[PDB]
Chains A and B, each alone.
Chain A
């Protein structure tokens, strides 16, 4: 259900709190303020594995996007390249609801 995650994330973009980018998704993890991490498929393996590590430490879920970094940016409805995402407040959506 790649389209079913794309639409939910589109709704999180309009409703909830969210954060983009490696240097700030990490800050959310250290604050433990995030609730779910989304990772583009071609996120550089060092970066991806260290974010996986912090997620394991913070007991937070990690989802691996089905596209690429350009596709994750487009799904978030942003005009640039994105490879990291954190859902701070899910908002009026059903992403954490998996």
Chain B
């Protein structure tokens, strides 16, 4: 069975985001035109949410619960994948298409929307492992 499919959680393993967690958005299994190695687009968390506790006020909880997302094309050798999953496939059209990432303005817009939806899923309380940072 293949375990590198969109929606699975993956820890980036090497380079300026090693140790960050992420979710595979779409997989370029059969290489590409200019990347003959196998690779796959991934969206992760550059800045994890800080711990939320009951003691702090609502403004500080909102302060502490925000995320910073990053889009990266990663070689499979550079990602060490995991069983866990993120059920948000609603970025399929958002960050999909081999066009939504070529340009900077487009990329940053995609990251803003991905921030909004990953913050919503962090609010939901599910997928706590995806938002607790790998403590290495």
Query: Do A and B touch (CB < 8 Å)?
Result: yes
**Number of inter-chain CB pairs below 8 Å:** 24
The residue of chain B having its C-beta at the shortest distance from the C-beta of A29 within the complex is: B3
Q: What's the least CB distance linking B13 to chain A, in Å?
A: 10
A30-B4, A30-B76, A32-B2 known; A57 vs B83 contact (CB < 8 Å): yes
Chain A residues with Cβ below 8 Å from B77 are 23, 26
Q: How far is the CA of A26 from the CA of B38 in the complex (A)?
A: 13
Asked if A58 is at the interface of the complex by the 8 Å CB criterion, the answer is yes
Interface membership of A63, Cβ < 8 A? no
Interface string of A40-52 (1 = CB under 8 A from B): 0000000000100
Q: List 24 A-B contacts (CB under 8 A).
A: A23-B77, A26-B77, A27-B38, A27-B76, A30-B2, A30-B3, A30-B4, A30-B38, A30-B76, A31-B2, A32-B1, A32-B2, A32-B3, A50-B80, A54-B3, A56-B83, A57-B3, A57-B81, A57-B82, A57-B83, A58-B1, A58-B2, A58-B3, A59-B1
Chain A interface residues toward B at CB < 8 A: 23, 26-27, 30-32, 50, 54, 56-59
